[PDB]
Design a binder for this molecule. Structure first.
Ligand SMILES: CCCCCC/C=C/CCCCCCCC(=O)O
Ligand SMILES: CCCCCC/C=C/CCCCCCCC(=O)O
Ligand SMILES: C[As](C)(=O)[O-]
Ligand SMILES: C[As](C)(=O)[O-]
Ligand SMILES: [Cl-]
Ligand SMILES: [Cl-]
Ligand SMILES: [Cl-]
Ligand SMILES: [Zn+2]
Ligand SMILES: [Zn+2]
Ligand SMILES: [Zn+2]
Ligand SMILES: [Zn+2]
Ligand SMILES: [Zn+2]
Lengths: 266, 266
């Protein structure tokens, strides 16, 4: 595929799910070979694993004293659409969560794709690799196409379910929203997070209930969202990825661990 | 005491807890003998029991095709400060919930009281009366001062608690907020209510937890609030009340039932 950028400046704004603060984004077009990077208060922060500073409840990046929280959703959308050159200027401390999914980003960016004059330099998984952590596991192996499977084992009515993304089915995961369990709320709040969370940007589930009046968009919306999250973290490899991935109960921490190990080997 | 009004108009705005819509109130001064009345779309709606049209999860008033939801908190504050003559213009279909208590109302009105030239004609409970409904009970009896006791019996950690309000202790209940149990949320949403509810205006409790990061303001905040609600509904009698009340598991429906029985007798 050919490298891509946006045809013109795109802007988004809204509350940040963790800071609870209002922020604004301005997606700037960039020429070939620029890569994906954020910009805040005069500092460019590459969307690469070396700049990850936090992975609890979100993937946060930082460099030279400037930090940006929750980059996983905008990065997933960029990855899915193969946007390889853009600057995400952030006026605030976190990416707006919007409705909790990548839908608004996906729709706006998709109709503004600009093909460029360079073949994409994909990060190709060359050999099988496995990372584990307290029951959690993620396996990566060679594949010409990007394939991502997430299998969850929830302690509520969701039980055990899995979902597989394959190229061409981007629309099956871009609407899946961020979710949380009611028994986790006190913890999240206690650690200074989730300050902007609400039923408008978060699917809140109980042992046997669904608090959102709109209910779930899909019976497996949570695992579709986990797949979406993983694809966003995978872009931290520095360029569109080609490989087959399987994640069992994975989260941002394990995702980043996998990325660093993959980067190290190749 | 002397009838009272406000020295100057007072405004309050925010979201309605049930409609989830923006709403605003403007309290305007009125001369002696006017009483408390709401104004909406050209219609005056007296703050009296004859105009109650709904009592499930809030006390709503209506007249000639115009309705206003959730008048209990503003009326409670007015009753407590003995404000007797005002016109409350309403923009929207419900009184803003603010933080779920009567604090903002109380502090603003308290500093803007204007004594008038006429003695207040209190509604004096003359003989004992009792109303019941599925285990719930409320008893009213004679007293030179307003005394209100609420005893709750909760299906969670709260267990059985009681709280007694007496004249002069207004500040002990004007900070107590609206509360709901996590197992009731789906029902409330299902009946088209609670659309503006959030941790900022509602104390949400579980079988063993408190979701709000700020926790409870008082270990018995819920019963203090129930006392606050009853005092607001009692003002539907048309004037400040003098009597001793005891409510066991009472709610707006039973509160209004009591008011109507008291009104009938006397
Ligand atoms: C239940 C209703 C209302 C208000 C929102 C409650 C706060 C939720 C916290 C924000 C969610 C953050 C994502 C964390 C979930 C995870 O790591 O699995
Ligand atoms: C899991 C946590 C929370 C989601 C918060 C949603 C807000 C609750 C709805 C508004 C409450 C309105 C009060 C009515 C309750 C009653 O009459 O018992
Ligand atoms: C837990 As999240 C903010 O990555 O959906
Ligand atoms: C249940 As209510 C809005 O009167 O606190
Ligand atoms: Cl944490
Ligand atoms: Cl955690
Ligand atoms: Cl009910
Ligand atoms: Zn190509
Ligand atoms: Zn945590
Ligand atoms: Zn996510
Ligand atoms: Zn109330
Ligand atoms: Zn109900």
């Amino acid at each position: 595929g050919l490298e891509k950028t946006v045809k013109e400046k795109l802007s988004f704004e809204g509350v940040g799910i963790h800071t609870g603060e209002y922020s604004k984004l301005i997606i700037h077009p960039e020429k070939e070979g620029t890569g994906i990077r954020f910009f805040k208060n005069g500092v460019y922060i590459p969307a690469r694993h070396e700049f990850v500073v936090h992975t609890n409840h979100s993937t946060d990046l930082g460099f030279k004293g400037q930090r940006i929280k929750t980059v996983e959703h905008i990065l997933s959308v960029l990855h899915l659409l193969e946007i390889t050159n853009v600057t995400i200027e952030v006026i605030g401390n976190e990416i707006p969560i919007l409705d909790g999914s990548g839908w608004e980003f996906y729709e706006a960016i998709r109709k503004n794709i600009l093909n460029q004059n360079r073949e994409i330099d994909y990060f190709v998984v060359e050999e099988p690799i496995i990372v584990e952590d307290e029951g959690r596991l993620i396996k990566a192996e060679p594949s010409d196409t990007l394939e991502v499977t997430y299998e969850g084992e929830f302690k509520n009515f969701l039980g055990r379910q899995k979902f597989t993304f394959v190229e061409g089915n981007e629309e099956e995961i871009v609407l899946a929203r961020t979710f949380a369990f009611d028994w986790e709320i006190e913890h999240i709040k206690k650690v200074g997070l989730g300050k902007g969370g609400s039923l408008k940007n978060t699917l809140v589930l109980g042992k046997d209930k669904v608090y959102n009046p709109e209910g779930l968009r899909y019976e497996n919306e949570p695992v579709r969202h986990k797949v979406f999250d993983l694809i966003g973290d995978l872009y931290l490899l520095g360029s569109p990825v080609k490989g087959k991935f399987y994640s069992f109960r994975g989260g941002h921490s394990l995702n980043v661990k996998l990325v660093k190990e993959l980067a190290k080997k190749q």
